[PDB]
Amino acid sequence: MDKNELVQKAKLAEQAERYDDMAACMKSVTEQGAELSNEERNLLSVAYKNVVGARRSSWRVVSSIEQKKQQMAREYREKIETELRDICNDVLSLLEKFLIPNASQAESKVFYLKMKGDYYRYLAEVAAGDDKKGIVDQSQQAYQEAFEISKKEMQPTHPIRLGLALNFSVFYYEILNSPEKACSLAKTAFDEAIAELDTLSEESYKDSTLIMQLLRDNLTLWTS
Amino acid sequence: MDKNELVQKAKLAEQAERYDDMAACMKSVTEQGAELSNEERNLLSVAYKNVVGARRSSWRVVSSIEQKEKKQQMAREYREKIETELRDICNDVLSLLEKFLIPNASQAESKVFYLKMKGDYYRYLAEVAAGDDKKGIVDQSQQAYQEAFEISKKEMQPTHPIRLGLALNFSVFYYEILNSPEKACSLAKTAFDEAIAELDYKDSTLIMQLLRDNLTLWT
């Protein structure tokens, strides 16, 4: 039903900073059932990252003011939390129903499994103490599978492989409270990527290099 | 609901940069009939400023694409959708102002501020106004601005920030919508010069640079 008209309208929304609209277009494109292109793939992700990220930022503000009649903050934080769980469940619904199953290329399988690890990580950050274990399990399980595949099929300099390391390391350090595992994951990714630094083209170097600078900062931050 | 709890909740939303929530809180407070305090009035204004301003910015962008074949058809389709949201938000504010905020207002300082808001919200409708109703909408913006302008003159000193903000906005109305640069330039210069002479609060200074920035761009 004019998927290009939606992929186009989605591009128009991102330009106008209307991510909620952009998400509505990309989700409809995903719902068709045809495997997404690498360009649609990245539009659906940017849309959802901005929509859920607004909620995460708001929650970190309302939950920081809660720390310092503040019962109102707890009520609002509950609100924002419901919006955030709803958006995560959405993305995860798309992931299980269409994206992961239609993923033919390995690079997309890693990109999608990483997204699943991130969206469960966002649910973990706001989880009821009871539900938290299961949700943490789900995130780690998704990232571990993406990891194994990226190791097998991608070069250490691949940005999807490097971005997976960055996010999986931040999951261990914050979600799992494991500094030794998180630092080790980030340092290996950086080291293996710099072992093969000669491979990066003049045109495509910045894509992996930017992520590497980021692995280093987390490591610098976590070690000091 | 509790009007103060809603007022508190609006402060939380603003800190969180959740304006649609902020606006929903402040709209309810105004509906109660309580005259807004110089704090509730600011909160209602900031919330709505940011709601409509997001639409105003997306409009300019989606239009710009139109001036810069199948895509052009789709952009107009998007431009019209954003226009409908923008009109809707303006009409909301205009209903509050006309129906509650302006009638309840007793002090002159508040009345000048509410009449300036009515001039701004009609100015935003004029920017996307359908050609048929375009003259009526501009008439309404100008009238709101002029009425506030005269009252400002007779009740405030030039240094007052509301009087200064009124001049800035009313000036930009003349240049952008009435295409009358001499008025807008002349009107803007007079407020600055009057502001410069009394110059006796540092919020007014912020406004003077904005007036200076515009006479300068127009220069």
Partner: peptide, 18 residues
């Protein structure tokens, strides 16, 4: 260029920036 009008507007680093 648009003319000026009033009013006017720690830790962690993960991929897909904003």
């Amino acid at each position: 260029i648009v003319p000026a009008t009033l009013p006017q507007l720690y830790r962690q680093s993960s991929a897909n920036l904003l």
